[PDB]
Write an enzyme that holds these catalytic residues in place. Structure first.
Site, PDB file in Angstrom:
ATOM      1  N   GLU A 357       7.364  -1.459  -5.754  1.00  0.00           N
ATOM      2  CA  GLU A 357       7.879  -0.230  -6.350  1.00  0.00           C
ATOM      3  C   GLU A 357       8.550  -0.501  -7.690  1.00  0.00           C
ATOM      4  O   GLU A 357       8.443   0.310  -8.617  1.00  0.00           O
ATOM      5  CB  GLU A 357       8.842   0.459  -5.385  1.00  0.00           C
ATOM      6  CG  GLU A 357       8.204   0.843  -4.060  1.00  0.00           C
ATOM      7  CD  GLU A 357       7.276   2.035  -4.179  1.00  0.00           C
ATOM      8  OE1 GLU A 357       7.423   2.812  -5.147  1.00  0.00           O
ATOM      9  OE2 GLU A 357       6.398   2.196  -3.306  1.00  0.00           O
ATOM     10  N   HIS A 487      -0.750   9.931   3.413  1.00  0.00           N
ATOM     11  CA  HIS A 487      -1.528  10.191   2.206  1.00  0.00           C
ATOM     12  C   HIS A 487      -2.597  11.256   2.396  1.00  0.00           C
ATOM     13  O   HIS A 487      -3.329  11.558   1.446  1.00  0.00           O
ATOM     14  CB  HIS A 487      -2.181   8.899   1.715  1.00  0.00           C
ATOM     15  CG  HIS A 487      -1.213   7.773   1.509  1.00  0.00           C
ATOM     16  ND1 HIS A 487      -0.384   7.308   2.507  1.00  0.00           N
ATOM     17  CD2 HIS A 487      -0.932   7.030   0.412  1.00  0.00           C
ATOM     18  CE1 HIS A 487       0.360   6.324   2.037  1.00  0.00           C
ATOM     19  NE2 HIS A 487       0.046   6.134   0.768  1.00  0.00           N
TER      20      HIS A 487
HETATM   21 ZN    ZN Z   1       3.228   2.093  -4.827  1.00  0.00          ZN
END
Ligand code: ZN
Ligand code: NAG
Ligand code: NAG
Ligand code: NAG
Ligand code: NAG
Ligand code: NAG
Ligand code: NAG
Lengths: 596, 196
Positions: A357, A487
């Protein structure tokens, strides 16, 4: 004056006047994901609507300027994106129900609790629980109950919502010069401006298959090796010729096989590459994980995290007092404000994602100099790949020994590298068939080649064939198991994760040339190499301005995704897996199921 | 020779926007520049054309001090011969500049919560600003060939609003800028140093 200049002074008015709106959406969007309230859902949606209204009004004003007259190509991209009719092609009848469905499917996924059949008042939720059960438990029945209840109590209620989700989305893409909603996502990888570096919507679907074919031999010997070592952990529950039960895999869906390392580690007595146990014993708090991740990027020349990062990011769970969306997220709010939201636990799987991240942030921070519409990754895979290049380097035992998470007298070996490579392959190699199948299911659903009465039949018809994973319990069409993942409930292009992987080893090899490296593609910690960092900095600063084919070529030398670096990384394992499958079956029977 | 009131312009409660900077004449006083060196809050204290150490030893007939608030990364545009949005449309320093440029962070004051949209800046101007020029015009910006009577597709309001928020990064944080120029004429030294 010219119409191109008339459009330059339109984007300039756009860029400066747009940021405080997008940011305002962001701040409110951050204030909901970190603080779940009915007051903050309204605030987030209002700023989202005002941001959407600014898009609609400044998209219509963008149509008047014709692209064909514009010659400056970087200007053409920004006008092209701003001229695109998004959900605007949908009437108020369609856009409302589409947004209403999308919010409803997200909330059902967010508020998905499963009640224990005994003591119904006891409810387990997918995030805190029902994921520890699906990642640590060795009880086939406990895993079967966590996997089936989540895809029935939560999955079935999404089946009617997903059915109308497809048609209302397909009406959007088909209206806006596409074939189906799948092409809308596939258009991410399209280049149609520069000869030689051009790309098409379909070229992805052929390149993915052409490159997935060369992964299949590696996957089979990973599948066979895991199957034989899962047959010991779950005796009389896995067919040595048949496929793998889904709930016995690493996570809730079989997306990652990382947790199976405990059951599949080749040489246990060697020091554990999974330093999760090491961190907890060393009191590695969440701050150290990101601080140690921060030092990694500093070592390669990339900047410290901004002061607004540490002050305003959310790295732990805020607690029971206030809820939070604890799905790991990196935020480019704009205005120089970079934050990471993540429910960081003291685990290696969170330590690596902190590098992942923060890789987004380093990508986000670099292309901040680009104009607003060009503030994005070269494609979808590039953003995910960049963070993985770090966790690829950070997971090496040499790097772990460098940060105090491995013994100072740790000596590398033939056996330890297999332990390290297999663990990496469970996360990386194991997810490629899952990602390829999942999108190909969605792609064909959007194209319509999978009818509504053959949805779940074709979802597991491919999961047995492509991924070698079997349904523990038969599933009606009433189930909607594809949507059980994040997702898909939250409508994100998932092929970015397959493309990410082929990029990440393509990048790492070039970054391990800029860093003078002796040995193989693993043991390749680019840490302390400024040459490796700056070579990436050049790619990151471009963002969307230069085509991703050119952006990739300047870094690695190939205008397309190459699977060869990935296999060369895992070659010491591929040869070792075959020698561990001489007296084992390689492949899987599609016909076997644990309920027949 | 009473001390020059440098505190009034620096420590001022409210600083103007960039498109209308505030110029204050300083004369008929002995200037203590040594108090300016001591202040450590000045993130960008950079004099151009004269060294600060010899400022106290030199005298000038006039001292102009310009105050305004720019964005964090736009402070670089307040510098000799620089180009950008602020330098070309808001406040241009002479290429032969002989003076100082001082700036510090004003989040605690200029920035609040929500959005402190109080500060503005000029986004469009037909000509580039000649050095030491101020354009207060609120008249529109005709980018196209159609007459401008209302803000429309190609008619833009020249001024736009800085969005200053405490969550913004250093680049998008408000910075107060004071520019001290000098002006030597055929006149007595109305601004001197403590020695003389
Ligand atoms: Zn990612
Ligand atoms: C969460 O939001 C509510 C209102 O939406 C607010 O009153 C509360 O202070 C927030 N919590 C924190 C910790 O800021
Ligand atoms: C397009 O215009 C921008 C305006 O800032 C300029 O920087 C860029 O160099 C131009 N592109 C080309 C190819 O000239
Ligand atoms: C967007 O819609 C308008 C009509 O509302 C149409 O004229 C225009 O061609 C569309 N733009 C694109 C890129 O499809
Ligand atoms: C990074 O942050 C540390 C922590 O304060 C600081 O000491 C160091 O100088 C910083 N380095 C860079 C290059 O930002
Ligand atoms: C990078 O350099 C620092 C500074 O001496 C050192 O402590 C660290 O071990 C180096 N990193 C690696 C991976 O060797
Ligand atoms: C601002 O005020 C403080 C005390 O109120 C003083 O010490 C400082 O010198 C002043 N700044 C200037 C530039 O005069």
């Amino acid at each position: 004056s010219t119409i191109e200049e008339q459009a330059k002074t339109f984007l300039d008015k756009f860029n400066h006047e747009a940021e405080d709106l997008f940011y305002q959406s962001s701040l409110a969007s951050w204030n909901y994901n970190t603080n779940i309230t009915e007051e903050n859902v309204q605030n987030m949606n209002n700023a989202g609507d005002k941001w959407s209204a600014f898009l609609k009004e400044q998209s219509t004003l963008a149509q008047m300027y014709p692209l064909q007259e514009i010659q400056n190509l970087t200007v053409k991209l920004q006008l092209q994106a701003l001229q695109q009719n998004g959900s605007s092609v949908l009437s108020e009848d369609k856009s409302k129900r589409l947004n209403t469905i999308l919010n409803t499917m997200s909330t059902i996924y967010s508020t998905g609790k499963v009640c224990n059949p005994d003591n119904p008042q006891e409810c387990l939720l997918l995030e805190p629980g029902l994921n520890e059960i699906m990642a640590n438990s060795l009880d086939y029945n406990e895993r079967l109950w966590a996997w089936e209840s989540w895809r029935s109590e939560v999955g079935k209620q999404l089946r009617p919502l997903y059915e109308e989700y497809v048609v209302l989305k397909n009406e959007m893409a088909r209206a806006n010069h596409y074939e189906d909603y799948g092409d809308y996502w596939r258009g991410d990888y399209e280049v149609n401006g520069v000869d030689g570096y051009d790309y098409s919507r379909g070229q992805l679907i052929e390149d993915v298959e052409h490159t997935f074919e060369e992964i299949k031999p590696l996957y089979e010997h990973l599948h066979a090796y895991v199957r034989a070592k899962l047959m010991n952990a779950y005796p009389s529950y896995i067919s040595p010729i048949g496929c793998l039960p889904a709930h016995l895999l690493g996570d809730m869906w079989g997306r990652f096989w990382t947790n199976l390392y405990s059951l599949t580690v080749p040489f246990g007595q060697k020091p554990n590459i999974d330093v999760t146990d090491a961190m907890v014993d060393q009191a590695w708090d969440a701050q150290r994980i990101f601080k140690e991740a921060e030092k990694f990027f500093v070592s390669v020349g990339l900047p410290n995290m901004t002061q607004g990062f540490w002050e305003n990011s959310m790295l732990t769970d805020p607690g029971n007092v206030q809820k939070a969306v604890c799905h790991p997220t990196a935020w480019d709010l704009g205005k120089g404000d970079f934050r990471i939201l993540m429910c960081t636990k003291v685990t290696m799987d969170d330590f690596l994602t902190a590098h992942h991240e923060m890789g987004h942030i380093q990508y986000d921070m670099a292309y901040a100099a680009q104009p607003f519409l060009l503030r994005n990754g070269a494609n979808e895979g590039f953003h995910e790949a960049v963070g993985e290049i770090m966790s690829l380097s950070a997971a090496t035992p040499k790097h772990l020994k460098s940060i105090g998470l491995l013994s100072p007298d740790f000596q590398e070996d033939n056996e330890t590298e297999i332990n390290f490579l297999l663990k990496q392959a469970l996360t990386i190699v194991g997810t490629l068939p899952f990602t390829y199948m999942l999108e190909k299911w969605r792609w064909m659903v959007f194209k319509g080649e999978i009818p509504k009465d053959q949805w779940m039949k074709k979802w597991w018809e491919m999961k047995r064939e492509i991924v070698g994973v079997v349904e523990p319990v038969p599933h009606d069409e009433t189930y909607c198991d594809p949507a059980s993942l994040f997702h898909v409930s939250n409508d994100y292009s998932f092929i970015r994760y397959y493309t990410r992987t082929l990029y990440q080893f393509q990048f790492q090899e070039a970054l391990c040339q800029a860093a003078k490296h002796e040995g193989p593609l693993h043991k390749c910690d680019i840490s302390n190499s400024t040459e490796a960092g700056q070579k990436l900095f050049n790619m990151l600063r471009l963002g969307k301005s230069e085509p991703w084919t050119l952006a990739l070529e300047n870094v690695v030398g190939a205008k397309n995704m190459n699977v060869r670096p990935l296999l060369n990384y895992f070659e010491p394992l591929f040869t070792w897996l075959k020698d561990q499958n001489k007296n084992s079956f390689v492949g899987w029977s599609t016909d076997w199921s644990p309920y027949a | 020779t009473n001390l020059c009131p440098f505190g009034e312009v620096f420590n001022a409660t409210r600083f103007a926007s960039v498109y209308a900077w505030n110029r204050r004449r300083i004369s008929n006083c002995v200037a203590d520049y040594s108090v300016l060196y001591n202040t450590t809050s000045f993130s960008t204290f950079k004099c151009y054309g004269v060294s600060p150490t010899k400022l106290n030893d030199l005298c000038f007939t006039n001292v102009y001090a310009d105050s305004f608030v720019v964005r964090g990364d736009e402070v670089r545009q307040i510098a000799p011969g620089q180009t950008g949005k602020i330098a070309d449309y808001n406040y241009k320093l002479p290429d032969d500049f002989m003076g100082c440029v001082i700036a510090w962070n004003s989040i605690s004051l200029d920035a609040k919560v929500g959005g402190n949209y109080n500060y503005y800046y000029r986004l469009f101007r037909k000509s580039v600003l000649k050095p030491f020029e101020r354009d207060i015009s609120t008249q529109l910006y005709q980018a196209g060939d159609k007459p401008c009577s209302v803000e429309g597709p190609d008619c833009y309001y020249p001024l736009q609003s800085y969005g200053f928020q405490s969550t913004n990064g250093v680049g998008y944080q408000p910075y107060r800028v004071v520019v001290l120029s000098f002006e030597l004429l055929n006149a007595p030294a109305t601004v001197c140093g403590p020695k003389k």
